[model samples]
Target: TIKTFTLPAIPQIMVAPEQRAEFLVKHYWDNVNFADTNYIHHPEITEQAWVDYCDILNHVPLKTAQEAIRKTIDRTNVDKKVFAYITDLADKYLYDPNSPMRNEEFYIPVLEAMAASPVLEEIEKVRPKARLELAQKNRIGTKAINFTYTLASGAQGSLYQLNADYLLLFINNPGCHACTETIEGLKQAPIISQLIKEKKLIVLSIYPDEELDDWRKHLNEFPKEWINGYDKKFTIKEKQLYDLKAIPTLYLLNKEKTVLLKDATTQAIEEYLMIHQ
Candidate 1:
């Protein structure tokens, strides 16, 4: 049997519809005492945190949620354990598989906070590992790494040299059915393929592994309309210049190579582009 826990009455300011979310979000962590280990271990606290986090991520927009997260940490002087609890809460909820919230967008602040922490070296390790995925470089909303490439047209140029409204980076492995399927399905994107015809978008698909034969064999399989290439100098893959936890990673960038999306699935990529267009 579970007993219901009653929270404080909604503030009188929250009587208005629009002010409710902001009021609730601003005070979500009020009951959690950072100095008290017993508060952290409370059975109900975990369950309540999940519900409150969903409220934050769902009721609030990404940019607003990001600011709320910053204000949550910065507004108070917290212990190392409190910071760890914050990290754990984020990981268990947003970072979990099939979470409604986007982890990459939501976890940036917490990860950065851990990175800049000076007190606990053990916990600080979260900074580097998470940074691999959450790093400022080439992340969504940051300028991408510059690289010279052999275009499918056989011309050599860097990312900035090729002008376009959007640059869609396709890092794929040859002979992988998933990669082939991903490329095939990409033609269905509402705006992406259409933008390619207008030259407003350029799909820079490159094979990054050492196996040249696999790449060459599958060259014909690649979409004819896109720019295809092989990384002969081994800059992207072996050199570890950019990330590829798995092949067929997709990156969407603006004219300046500022990333708008990174390593998202085909469907997720299309949704962002479609909505923005």
Candidate 2:
């Protein structure tokens, strides 16, 4: 059965753009009856709507986004099948490492709802509860998780010890296309480059994998100024110190090691720096 989820029209009485968006976020799901399982089966249509909903959430206040997600979960939880479908969509869009729409803060409310869902057994709650804990780590405005990185020459350095106004933590693999593109992006960003030239921004590119030979071979790929190192102890992957869901995962942290942006894209990091300049 192919059924479509129709979006609700905003009331014309809402004059301001923010007011219209707030209204849309509030009544976005009013027309959809989650009890009807037929609509849930068509992921093609529903997933698109889910993405659109996430895009809308990006513009609203964090508090508003949290409330909307919690309420959506409450409504969908009425049906077990529907609840699973909706949360799965949230995971793919908001939690997947490769997803451009990935936003940990946005996914937090989804996990919180699932963690407290009466529909799920205590055993089922364990995963979401654990994931929620992980999601909270190194969150924006919080101090980043500290880790040691060893240079190719065997010199050791810790994240906290790095002295710079900003630190770009780049978790990448050797010879990865996306990683190469990110490197180029950083090099081309005038603001980032100028900051690096001034010793204000330090790009710490750490290889989290175990292939030392491959990493050593590609040493020239990274800029000489950047701290190109590898996790010799392999604690990052073992302990899950950072959410490395995918390679080339980027994070922008301040001098105090507070995470300014987590799991950020190259463009986003560049734009943020330029905007703040």
Candidate 3:
């Protein structure tokens, strides 16, 4: 089935309106056991309760959540088991593909705080070494991966090669359903267009596969304003520079190539730019 479009979720389905404030306050810490690790796998199994606890964090501010988390650990007298749970909790929320709060801003700092605890040097770089490696490179508040890519002009282009307030790198493949809508939606944002007009932003759309003939055909469908590019030698994909596990990944970078948002959504980019603008 060719699905042309789909809808984003409405919050109403997640929480009923009349009881919202009361329910959130009453149930904020309903499912977690600060002392017990086995408490993690309940409500569905395989860390379900832990993930459920992580979901509760979204309702509270991360600042609030972090204080609560650390305070509870301290209250537990720096329980090593509790410390381990929080480390694992930080890892799961920050790196899990299915997490709603896949937020490096909130969780990576949590990891570093935990990682720095020599208390936790042994805990640093736990299992899922691949994600930890990516965190080292792509974490929020860190320098982004800067590579030399081929320009449409067939001249090579380095990431720092562009001098703009923001660099939007959109990595996508042909015929991806979400990629098409993402492209259209990003271009339609008034803030994005204004940034482009002011020369403060550059959007580079990249196709990162072989099959040059297919890409040549694919190139015609995209808007001309974007520096529609092909990862000419497939250097990014083959070299594992980006750690992109899926397509339609978007990134926002500062002029110095520091990552602002990693694997960002269109809404996230627009909101960030508008607020910063």
Candidate 4:
């Protein structure tokens, strides 16, 4: 019985025409490096598909792509051909001015590729420009400080005390334009509202101005259920403890009442929340 069985041949699977087109665009679109390659490959190719592919490349997580490229660049001595291919692709799609995927995300990988491809001097020349541009776009190396403020309710409510594992102290002049924008940004953040619901965090705006009534009225527009305190006494103890170097400064604190960061921007505050919370 064991020797008597014959298996039938498996049927060949066919990919759908659209799926095949997608696959080709994703895996091999860049393989053909000719101006009229799309025409040569398929006469019926849709321009929308090409646009979608570019969008995918642009939206690809920057960190993942950079790390993969870095690994290849580091192994240049062992696999020079592969490294060369990576470097070419990086320069063509990442650094090319006419590239559909030009973005700040590509800067780091481009710099790395240049450094490894005997163009270290070029990288050094352009590195500061790329860095300053990226710095403006993305909040990097920014610090925020947090400290506990005992509410009139006697609850030891610090930015850390709320459910948010990280907190930013928005010190305001009560009439400052920048302070108004900061409060607006915090109120608009959905994650912040969710954290407030979870009882994990609160946005405490400390107005140093004597106009406590106006500050209360302004905070009333959004979620004002959180702690809002004003020290009319202008106590040196409060000012000295938080180190109020400037109005509208932010202090990010940890759960244990330790200052984690200081003078962080709104973006930096959000980034810190993402990391710690």
Which lDDT values do the candidates have, in the order given? 0.70, 0.88, 0.67, 0.51
Winner on TM-score between 3 and 4 is 3
Ranking by TM-score: 2, 1, 3, 4
What are the TM-scores, per candidate, against the unseen true structure?
A: 0.75, 0.93, 0.67, 0.40
Q: Per-residue lDDT for 251 in model 1?
A: 88
Query: Which sections of candidate 3 miss by over 4 Å?
Result: 1-42, 45-48, 59-99, 105-127
Worst 10 residues of 1 by lDDT: 1-10
Q: How many steric clashes between backbone atoms does each model show?
A: 0, 0, 0, 15
Candidate 3 backbone clash number: 0
User: With candidate 3 superimposed using the best TM-score fit, by how many Å does residue 216's alpha carbon deviate from the native?
Assistant: 1.8
Clashing pairs in 2: none
lDDT of 4 by residue, 1-277 (tens): 3321122332236356544433333343333223333333443342333334445444345565455445434544344443444445555554454564544354465454554555235545475345434323212233333345444444554444455554445667665777777777887766677766776765676655566667656755434555676555544234444434346666666544355555566676677677666
Summing lDDT over every window of 10 consecutive residues in candidate 2, give the lowest-scoring window.
37-46
Q: All predictions: root-mean-square deviation over Cα?
A: 4.1, 2.2, 9.5, 14.1
lDDT (tens digit, per residue) of candidate 3 on 1-277: 4222222223565575444533453344434444554434442342554465566656766566665555433433245666666566666676565565676555645554553454444545463344545667766678877677665568777777788999999988877788878888897899999998899998887777887677676676677767777787787888777867657888999988898988888999999999996
As for TM-score, the candidate ahead, 1 or 4, is 1
C-alpha-based local distance difference test score of model 3: 0.67
lDDT of 2: 0.88
Error of 3 at 82 (Å): 12
Tens-digit lDDT track of model 2 for 12-91: 78899898888889888887878885454676877778889999887778999899999999888888888988998889
